[PDB]
Amino acid sequence: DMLTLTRYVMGELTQLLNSMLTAIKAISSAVRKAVKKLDVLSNSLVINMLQSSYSTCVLVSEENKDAIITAKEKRGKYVVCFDPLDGASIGTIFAIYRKPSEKDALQCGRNIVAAGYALYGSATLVALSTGQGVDLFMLDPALGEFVLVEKDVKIKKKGKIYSLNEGYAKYFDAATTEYVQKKKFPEDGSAPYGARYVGSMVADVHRTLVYGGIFLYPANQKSPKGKLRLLYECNPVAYIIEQAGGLATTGTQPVLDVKPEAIHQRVPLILGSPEDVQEYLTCVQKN
Amino acid sequence: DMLTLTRYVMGELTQLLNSMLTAIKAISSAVRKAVKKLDVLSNSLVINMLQSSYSTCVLVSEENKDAIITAKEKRGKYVVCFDPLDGASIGTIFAIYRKPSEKDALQCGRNIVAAGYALYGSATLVALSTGQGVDLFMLDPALGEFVLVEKDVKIKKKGKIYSLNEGYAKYFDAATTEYVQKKKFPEDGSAPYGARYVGSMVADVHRTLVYGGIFLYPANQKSPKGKLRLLYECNPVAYIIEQAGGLATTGTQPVLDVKPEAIHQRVPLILGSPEDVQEYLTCVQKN
Amino acid sequence: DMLTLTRYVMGELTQLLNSMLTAIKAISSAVRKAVKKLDVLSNSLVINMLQSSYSTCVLVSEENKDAIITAKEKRGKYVVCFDPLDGASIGTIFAIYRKPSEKDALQCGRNIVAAGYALYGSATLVALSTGQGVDLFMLDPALGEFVLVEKDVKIKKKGKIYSLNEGYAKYFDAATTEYVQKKKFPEDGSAPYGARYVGSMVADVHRTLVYGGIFLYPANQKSPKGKLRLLYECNPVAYIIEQAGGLATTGTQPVLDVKPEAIHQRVPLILGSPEDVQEYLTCVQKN
Amino acid sequence: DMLTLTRYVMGELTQLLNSMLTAIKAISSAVRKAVKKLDVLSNSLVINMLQSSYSTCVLVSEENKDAIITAKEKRGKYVVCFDPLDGASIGTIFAIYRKPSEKDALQCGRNIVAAGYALYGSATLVALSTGQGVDLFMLDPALGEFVLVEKDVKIKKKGKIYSLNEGYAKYFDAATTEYVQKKKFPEDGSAPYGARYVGSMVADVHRTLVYGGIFLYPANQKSPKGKLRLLYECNPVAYIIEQAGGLATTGTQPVLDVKPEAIHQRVPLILGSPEDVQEYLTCVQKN
C-alpha cells in the first residue's frame, strides 16, 4: 500500500505542456466547485498560464474572435489552439504547433507537435500525445500532479458502438443515413451495434478511444460544414485518435490533411476504430 | 466568501437515510480512486452500513440472489431495495419501505417511504425524496456531508430530448418505432428532438430530471420485459421522477403500481416530462 | 447528515476580505503540497490577489523591503500589512487599515479595521475580526469556501499555560526571569503552569486563544526590541486577542498603542489571558 | 509535471502493515473533519482493520484495559501494540511483534519487527521501519496511498533544540535540572540551545528526528516512572529513533531493553541525537 513517484517525460515544449496541465488542474477545480462565467474563467486561466510559459507566440481560443498574440517579451516558438471548456463530463481540448500572425495557427493538423484533451469526470483524465503514441493520465489533486495510468493507448480495430445525434435524421446526408441503417440492420447476420451519445464531444471521443467504435458529427442540412471546430476540437482529437491507431475523416479527406481557411472554421468529423471509419467511407464513396 | 452551515432535515427513518448516505460517501471515494471487485466492495458497504443503522429488517440487493435478513438484534422497521453500483457517471439507487421475509420487499412502488439515487460525476450528486418533493444534494467530501443545492426540483412539462438505445431498432415494438419516428420527423412543423443516451441509467435519468424530455428502456424482442430491475432501479427512479412532477410507465401501467412478482423482476421503463410520456402512451394505446 | 449553506457577512472592505481569503486558500493548497520558493510564491499570491480587489492603495509585506503602491487604476481606500508565510503549523497574518504613501501603513494598531490570521494545520483555520469580536472559520477546500465554526470567540480570564523560548534564559530581562520563576514556582500554593512553545507564532497564539494562558516574545539581550514585527505580526494578533477579551503588551504599553517608526519595526510581544498578562506587567513595573 | 507510480515494498507482515496504513488513512480523514468519541472511533478502526488482516493474534491498545485476542479464525503470527490517537498535530503510534496471551505483547522493544507513527498535520506523514532504516511517507488522500518522500532518514549526531515541559521544574530530578541548566547556560562558550515543546509526543519526536536535538519526558516527583507508555508510545518511537541513528533511554537503560512488567506500564523517555542523549546520560551517572 505504499508508492514511489518518478518524474515522467513524454525545453520550451515541455514547459508549455507543464503550463497547459497547470491550467487544466485549475479548470478541474473550478468545474468540481460549480455557465458563461465558468467559460470566461477557464479561458483566462489557459491564456494567462500559456503566456507566462514563455513558449508561445500565438494563441487561438474557441472563446476569442481573433488570434491572441503573446507579448513580445514572453514570446516563444509555439502556437496553441484550444477549447478551454467544451460541453455530464465536460472537457478541455488543445493542439500545439511550431510557428508572427494568424498564418501560424492556420497549419493543417499534420503539423501538430503535441495535442491533448482533458475530461472532467469522477476523475480528471488527460489524454496526451507528442507524436509517439497516446498516454493517459489522471489528475491527482492531492499532489497537484498528473499520474500516468496507461501507456501507448491503442483503439480496437473494430468496435460495436456508434455515436451520433440521431435526432438530426431528417437532415442526414445519404451516406450517414445508409451507415446508420447498416449499424441497426446489419446485412451480414451480425448483431446490431449499440448506440451511445453523451452530447459532449470529449466524453464521446474518450469513450470511443477506450471502448472502440465510431463517433460522428457529419455534415447535415442545417450544418453543411458540420458543427465541430477544426482548429481546436477536430484536429486535436483526430491527432489523438490517429496516434491510438484510429482514423478521423471529414467524409472526403483525413481531418489532419484539411488546409484551414479560417481560425473558427467548422468541419465534419467522423472518427474511431479504423474498420468502422472505413465502412463509413464506403457509404460516402458509393453515394 | 464565508459560509454558515445548518443541519437539514427532510427517528429510525432519519438514521436509515444517514447510513445510506454514509455508504454513498464511501462508494464515491472508491469510485474516484478506481470492476467486479468494486461491485463486491460497494455492496458490502451498503449492506453493512444499512444493517448497523438498527433500522432495517430486510435488504434486497442487485448483487445478491436472495433477500438479506437483518440479524435479530439489529432489527428495525424498514426494508431497503438497492443497486449499489449501477453502470461516464455510474450510480447508486435505493428505495425504502416499511415492513419478517421477502414479502416485505415485494411491495408496489406506491408504498415507498423514501428513495434516492447518487450519481458519481465531477461532483457526487444525490437526489432524494421522502414524499414531499425532490431535493438535490452534493457531497462535500471535505466536510463528509451532503449539502442541499436545490429544493423541490421540478421537471419541465415538456422537453426536447429523447433518450434510448436506438441500436435496438430492429427489435423495437411498434409503439416505440412510432414514437421515435415522431421525435425525428415531427408532424406538426416543430423541430426534431435532440437525442442523448449515456448508457448509464442514473446518468440518463438525472439528465432527464434537470433538462426535461424522456428516457426509455422499453420492452423489445430480445428483452420482452425490459432490462431494468423493478425493485431497485425502476421503482426508485419512478418515485423520484413522479415527486418532481414527471411520469413513469411500463407502457401499460405506472411503474409504481406494478405488483412485484419477484425481487429481481425486470420491467419496461419509460419516464420523464409528463407531456412526453403521455405522447409515448398514445403510441401504445393506438397500437 | 445533510446541510444547508448560507452566505455569512461579518463594499470595498468585503471585496478585500474576500480576496485575502482567496489568497489564503491558494497558500493552503501550496503548503499541503510542499522553502524560500514557497515564501516567494505565497507573497505573489497575496500581492496579486489584493491588488485586483480594487480596494487597496498600499501594501506592506514581510517579504518586501519597501511598501508596495497599488497601480493607480486598481486603487481603493485600504492599506494592508501582511506576513504571507510565517514559520508544524505555519501561518499567514494580516491587518487592514483605511488610508498615497508609507504614511498610510504606519498607523498605530488602534486604527485597524479588520485583521486575521490563518493557520495551516490538519485543517486550515482562519481567525478574523472586523471590530465586533473574533470569528473562527475552517477552510472547506471542496467548496472553496470558509465555514464559520465559532462565533465571538472569548479567551479565558486566566489560563494555566505559559509559552516562550526558555532557551533564551541567559538573555532574559529581570521581569521575564521573575515571571517565568513564578509560573514554575507559584508562591500561593497553586500548581505550576504547563509550558508549550511550538516556535511558530501563529500556532502559539492560536493555542493561547483557544486554551488560555500567555504567550511571550519579550525583549532580551540579543533582541533588545524583540523579534516579532509590529506592522504584520504583532499588531494583527494583538487586535485579534483584544477582540477576544485578552491583552497584548510590549511590556511598557499596549501593542496597539505603539506608534510605528518604520514598516519593518520589531516590538516585544506579550499576550493572552488578561489576568496572566497583568501579572507579567506587575513584574515589569516592579523591576 | 507528470508522474509515474510504482509499488513500494519495505506475506502476513506486509498485509499487516497494509491494514495498519488503511486504518491511519481512515483516522486521518476523521481528524481532518473534526474528543473521546474520536478516540473511541480511532480505536475501533485500528482494531477492526488489524483483525481482518488475518495476521494478528494479540492486540494491545492504549484505549483498552486488557489485551485483545483475535478471533481464532482470523488469527495470524503477529502482536500489535498501538496508541490509536495520541495528543496541533496529534498522532497514531504502533509497534509489531511476532508471538496465545498477554505474554506475547510483553516482549522488550528489542524484539520489534516493524514500528511506526503517523502525524496528522497539514499533511499526514508516516514514519515507518522494518529493521533496515526509517522511511518517511505522505498520505496521498486522492490516491488512497502512502507516497515515499524520504528513504533511510538519519538524525543529526548532535542538535541545537531541547524539548521538555519546563513547567515541571519544581519536580525535576537532579540530572534533568542539571541538563536543562547546561542547555541554557553552556559552559563551553557555545550558544544556548533553542527550546521547543508542542506537548504532543508524536509532534515533538518527529521534529526531533528531522531537525535533531533531544526530547525528554523524564521521571519527576509527580510521575516517578514517567508519563509515556512503554508498549505503544516509548518502544515504537525508540525503535524509529534508533533506526535513524539516534538513542532512546529511560535514564538508566535503553528503552528497547526494558523488560515490560505490565501492558500499560509507563517509563521515562529521553531520545534524540546520540551526542545529546549521551550528554543527558552523563548528568544521570554523575548524580
Ligand SMILES: O=P(O)(O)OC[C@H]1O[C@](O)(CO)[C@@H](O)[C@@H]1O
Ligand atoms: O447537440 P448536438 O448538435 O448533438 O451538439 C453536440 C456537440 O456540441 C458540443 O457540446 C459543443 O462543442 C460538443 O461538445 C458536442 O459534441
Ligand SMILES: O=P(O)(O)OC[C@H]1O[C@](O)(CO)[C@@H](O)[C@@H]1O
Ligand atoms: O446497453 P443497454 O442495453 O442500452 O443498457 C443500458 C442500461 O444498462 C445498465 O448499465 C445496467 O443497469 C443501466 O445503467 C443502463 O440504463
Ligand SMILES: O=P(O)(O)OC[C@H]1O[C@](O)(CO)[C@@H](O)[C@@H]1O
Ligand atoms: O526561534 P525563536 O527565536 O523562538 O523564534 C520563534 C518565532 O520566529 C518565527 O518563526 C518567525 O516569525 C515566529 O513564527 C516564531 O514566533
Ligand SMILES: O=P(O)(O)OC[C@H]1O[C@](O)(CO)[C@@H](O)[C@@H]1O
Ligand atoms: O502535558 P504534559 O505533562 O507535558 O504531557 C505531554 C504528553 O502527554 C501526551 O499528550 C499524552 O500521551 C503526549 O502526546 C505528550 O507527550
